[PDB]
Amino acid sequence: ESVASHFALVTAYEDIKKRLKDSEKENSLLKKRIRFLEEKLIA
Amino acid sequence: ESVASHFALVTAYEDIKKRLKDSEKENSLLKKRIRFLEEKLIA
Amino acid sequence: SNFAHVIFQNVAKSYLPNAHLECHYTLTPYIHPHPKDWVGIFKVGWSTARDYYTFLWSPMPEHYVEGSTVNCVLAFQGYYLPNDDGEFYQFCYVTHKGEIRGASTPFQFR
Amino acid sequence: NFAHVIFQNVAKSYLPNAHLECHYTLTPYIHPHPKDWVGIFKVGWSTARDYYTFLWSPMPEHYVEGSTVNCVLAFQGYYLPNDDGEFYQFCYVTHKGEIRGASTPFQFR
């Protein structure tokens, strides 16, 4: 059971690691879209 | 040291958990800004 | 190995806090279910089968044939589910002998 | 039992195959040794043999029992992981094998 607990935690960690990478990539895109939209308003 | 390994993994998971929660939080706010900016610009 | 004889299907990344939740899962040919098997909703990082947030007994499949693949569904009620508490949870299938035989990807209630 | 060395200013990301400086602090709760080592470990490691690389944690000069001394180690990019998507952490492992420090995770990217 101690082994199952460690396995289940690695499995959860691996999924949250992937989701962090997806989140950070979206973060970069949304920030570029904002810079583009703010830049449109200054002209 | 199976419990040290579990401990180290728990704390590593908790850090990545917090990073994911913050990144998704910011992402939702970034989307609110994009709508707010676009409302000034297109339709 | 033994930890993946039950497969949780189409688990989402998050569920609405305190909303009714259907939990779908599959018994592979490697497990013979038992009426005292159960599915728990566990905070990620749990140490024992005792650390569950809520649970439901797993209904013994009717007309069960050994070595078959069987689909199962459990309706967790919102009033026994986490609120938006900042935590991540997962489903775990626990046999009547105490073994964890499947554990899902994690989800948050928000 | 596991927080007796603290890694300071440990970041989220270090450049791959690049010169890295590793800052950590010896707290008066455990005692340094010349053959104590700082290992870099993939998150999820099971035993101390799962290290990626390490370096000997040098002994500070005129070491006074029960002090607080900060240390710096310079791993070089030849020994460090690539941009592999994995999370690693710092682990202080002593000469008799116990780990008394596990940093927050970082990537190499």
From Swiss-Prot, chains A, B:
Compartmental location: Cytoplasm
Which residue windows are transmembrane per the record?
none
Q: How is it modified after translation?
A: Ubiquitinated via 'Lys-48'-linked polyubiquitination by TRIM38, leading to its degradation.
Where is it made, tissue-wise?
Answer: Widely expressed. Abundant expression seen in the pancreas and testis.
Q: Which domain of life is it from?
A: Eukaryota
Task: Please give the coiled-coil regions recorded for this protein.
Answer: 8-43
Q: How does it assemble?
A: Homodimer. Interacts with IKBKE. Interacts with TBK1. Interacts with TICAM1. Interacts with TAX1BP1. Interacts with CALCOCO2.
Q: What does this protein do?
A: Adapter protein which binds TBK1 and IKBKE playing a role in antiviral innate immunity. Activates serine/threonine-protein kinase TBK1 and facilitates its oligomerization. Enhances the phosphorylation of NF-kappa-B p65 subunit RELA by TBK1. Promotes TBK1-induced as well as TNF-alpha or PMA-induced activation of NF-kappa-B. Participates in IFNB promoter activation via TICAM1.
This protein is called what?
Answer: 5-azacytidine-induced protein 2
The organism encoding this protein is Homo sapiens (Human)
Swiss-Prot record, chain D:
Q: What happens to this protein after translation, modification-wise?
A: Phosphorylated in the C-terminal region by CHUK/IKKA leading to NF-kappa-B signaling down-regulation.
* Highest taxon in the source lineage: Eukaryota
Tissues expressed in:
Expressed in all tissues tested.
Where is this protein found? Cytoplasm; Mitochondrion; Preautophagosomal structure; Cytoplasmic vesicle, Autophagosome
* Function of the protein: Ubiquitin-binding adapter that participates in inflammatory, antiviral and innate immune processes as well as selective autophagy regulation. Plays a key role in the negative regulation of NF-kappa-B and IRF3 signalings by acting as an adapter for the ubiquitin-editing enzyme A20/TNFAIP3 to bind and inactivate its substrates. Disrupts the interactions between the E3 ubiquitin ligase TRAF3 and TBK1/IKBKE to attenuate 'Lys63'-linked polyubiquitination of TBK1 and thereby IFN-beta production.
Query: Quaternary structure per UniProt?
Result: Homooligomer. Interacts with TNFAIP3. Interacts with STARD13. Interacts with MYO6. Interacts with TOM1; the interaction is indirect and is mediated by MYO6, which acts as a bridge between TOM1 and TAX1BP1. Interacts with MAVS; this interaction induces MAVS polyubiquitination. Interacts with TNIP1. Interacts with TRAF6; this interaction mediates deubiquitination of TRAF6 and inhibition of NF-kappa-B activation. Interacts with RIPK1; this interaction negatively regulates RIPK1 ubiquitination. Interacts with NBR1. Interacts with TBK1. Interacts with RB1CC1. Interacts with SQSTM1.
* Protein name (database record): Tax1-binding protein 1
Give the organism's phylogenetic lineage.
Eukaryota, Metazoa, Chordata, Craniata, Vertebrata
